[PDB]
Design a binder for this molecule. Sequence first.
Ligand SMILES: CC(=O)N1CCc2[nH]c3ccc(Cl)cc3c2C1
Length: 116
Amino acid sequence: SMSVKKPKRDDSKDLALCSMILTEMETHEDAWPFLLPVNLKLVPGYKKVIKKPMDFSTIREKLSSGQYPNLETFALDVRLVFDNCETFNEDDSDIGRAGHNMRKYFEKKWTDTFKV
Ligand SMILES: CC(=O)N1CCc2[nH]c3ccc(Cl)cc3c2C1
């Protein structure tokens, strides 16, 4: 509260570390569904159903331009990619599997980097 803060957890390297995680995300073999925004003119249903589209390129641009106030808003956008993928894709599809795989890969990197 006013004049009462817990000790400052060091956040100076967060930007760089989130960038590194994102690079690892971008270069994963199963990232292909997520690299660019879904083409809303070419994918029937997507626009109406998915209220907040997100993709890796959009996250990279937001990151590079200071649009994440903190590491948690970054993780919210990453998770949004996978949440959308689950909303739109059957688990037993290539893309549904890719999303589960990428979520798993992300969350380990996330824990190991910021919670281990
Ligand atoms: C991620 C997802 O729900 N999408 C919607 C379905 C879909 N199909 C694709 C084929 C090729 C590429 Cl590169 C991406 C896609 C997507 C993206």
